[PDB]
Design a binder for this molecule. Structure first.
Ligand SMILES: CSc1nc(N)nc(-c2csc(C)n2)n1
Lengths: 300, 237
């Protein structure tokens, strides 16, 4: 089990760790989060009690270092930092647990929610989309734009996501204009899966990453990316049965986890009616279709 | 973006543009089969591509052979239309290529856009106008060349005859669409109007009769009366 300590909590803030969240009051004796499952990627995220604008947070994998949080009163936010002095870090962590100033990552033993949301999210791959190499963790926030959004403005603070564009020379083979645009199997299987991702696991890795950023930070370009990558599979007549089956699981947990009241902003009516009712895969997403009809019948 | 009443005069500036209408590309008769089921039989069609400033018409003839063994022909027709427009642009010298193509039906935007990916600098636009170019097959010489074709064929016309010698393209285009709006609302009456007088002929290299300026004025008012009427006859007013 890992620990992410906090130097202190000077400002009132709601802290999230994965899908959990808890309020901390201004200068309350809070010193961080303990019992965090090793073996998964995590995100710790923040919304100031004073400025619900700008949700922000840090993706990290405890195996890649000792990490802690420290408020910076110049920049005005909780910053993640690495402690390379492992001795100093264990000493710090032990003192704060002894004083019991830490909240426990509160995983119910039955619950595989976080695993199912993050199954293929590699942390080295996150680094190549939120490019900031001097850090082992990655910062994201509500306002960061994607590389493709900057095509249609700072590249360093961008989310380099795989560029998907259904009306592009990449998507469309000359002489197969009608065929490739109505059935995108070639774009999916050869261009994307065989040329960019290498395998469906990597496709899912970015797709999951795109969703979580949309959900935890209301990041609009991520939401667009999540829908694009779904749409590309739903608009392909030829998809391996195993990808379809795993996509159905993936989307099921994402729909399951979404806040019931955020549905109107994080779900694109058009893409989902296509996946569920119009597209080649209308018959192939049974779990996803069942939870959507029972939880968001208004959208369809 | 969309073309409508407000940006009407853009059609007559000096940026090369074409209208594309696909309403006559896929044409069928519907008949009964021996077993009493219904079946379609395709007939030749055409793509109506028109430069509204010059009157040049690139009438691409769609021979029924293109449909043989295909499914979902109505959808294919849109992509075939886009394929042919694309081929046409590519065959024109650069200085003759259009800067905009305006499709008369929104369902053409995606097919053309995809076919025109090689030409990012050519704008594909819809329109909110209700243009009567479907009545293009009510022009006898155009219907004639379509119905006689034995193979895919492109035939060039000036849909304004020599009108531009005496009037502007704004006026020429308004005369054309009035003529076509009438031919669409009542083809018999429209055609009667145009040809009642045997002494006004259609030159061999023209499509419409050789009216004087004054005769065109009488013709134009007659087509107006026809349209307003059929509007009454239809809504009883
Ligand atoms: C979490 S982001 C992510 N996750 C995985 N597992 N792969 C990728 C990825 C994109 S292109 C490529 C070869 N891999 N991206």
């Amino acid at each position: 089990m890992n620990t992410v300590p906090f130097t202190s909590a000077p400002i009132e803030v709601t802290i999230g760790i994965d899908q959990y969240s808890f309020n901390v009051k201004e200068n309350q004796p809070f010193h961080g989060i303990k019992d965090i499952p090793i073996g998964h990627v995590h995100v710790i995220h923040f919304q100031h009690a004073d400025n619900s604008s700008m949700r922000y947070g840090y993706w990290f994998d405890c195996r890649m270092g000792n990490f802690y949080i420290q408020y910076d009163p110049k920049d005005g936010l909780y910053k993640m930092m690495e402690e390379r002095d492992g001795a100093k870090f264990e000493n710090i962590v032990h003192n704060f647990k002894e004083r019991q100033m830490m909240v426990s990552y509160p995983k119910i033993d039955e619950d595989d929610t976080w695993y199912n949301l993050t199954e293929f999210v590699q942390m080295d791959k996150i680094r190549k989309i939120v490019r900031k190499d001097e850090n082992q963790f990655s910062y994201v926030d509500s306002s960061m734009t994607t590389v493709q959004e900057n095509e249609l403005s700072d590249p360093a603070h961008s989310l380099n996501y795989t560029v998907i564009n259904f009306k592009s020379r990449e998507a469309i083979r000359p002489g197969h204009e009608m065929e490739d645009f109505l059935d995108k199997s070639y774009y999916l299987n050869t261009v994307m899966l065989q040329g960019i991702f290498k395998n469906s696991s990597n496709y899912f890795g970015e797709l999951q990453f795109a969703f979580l950023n949309a959900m935890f930070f209301g990041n609009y370009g991520s939401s667009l990316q999540w829908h694009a990558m779904i749409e590309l599979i739903c608009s392909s007549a030829t998809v391996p049965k195993h990808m379809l089956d795993k996509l159905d699981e993936i989307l099921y947990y994402q729909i399951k986890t979404l806040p019931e009241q955020y549905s109107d902003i994080l779900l694109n009516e058009r893409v989902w009616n296509i996946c569920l009712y119009s597209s080649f895969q209308k018959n192939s997403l049974h779990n996803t279709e069942k939870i959507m009809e029972n939880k968001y019948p208004e959208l369809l | 973006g969309a073309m409508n009443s407000s940006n009407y005069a853009e059609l007559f500036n000096n940026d090369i543009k074409l209208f594309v209408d696909d309403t006559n590309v896929y044409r069928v008769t519907v008949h009964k089969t021996f077993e009493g089921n219904v079946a379609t039989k395709a007939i030749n069609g055409c793509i109506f591509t028109l430069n509204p400033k010059t009157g040049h018409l690139f009438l691409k003839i769609i021979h029924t052979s293109v449909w043989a063994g295909q499914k979902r022909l109505s959808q294919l027709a849109k992509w075939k239309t886009a394929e042919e427009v694309s081929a046409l642009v590519r065959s024109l010298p650069k200085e003759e290529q259009p800067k905009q193509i305006i499709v008369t039906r929104k369902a053409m935007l995606d097919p053309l856009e995809v076919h025109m990916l090689d030409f990012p600098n050519i704008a594909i636009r819809p329109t909110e106008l209700r243009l009567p170019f479907s009545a293009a097959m009510s022009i006898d010489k155009l219907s004639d060349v379509v119905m006689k074709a034995t193979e895919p064929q492109m035939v060039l016309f000036n849909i304004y005859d020599d009108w531009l010698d005496r009037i502007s393209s704004y006026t020429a285009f308004s005369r054309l669409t009035l003529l076509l709006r009438a031919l669409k609302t009542n083809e018999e009456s429209a055609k009667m109007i145009l040809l009642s007088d045997p002494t006004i002929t259609i030159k061999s290299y023209h499509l419409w009769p050789s009216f004087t300026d004054e005769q065109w004025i009488t013709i134009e008012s007659q087509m107006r009366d026809l349209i307003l009427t059929e509007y009454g006859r239809k809504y009883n007013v």
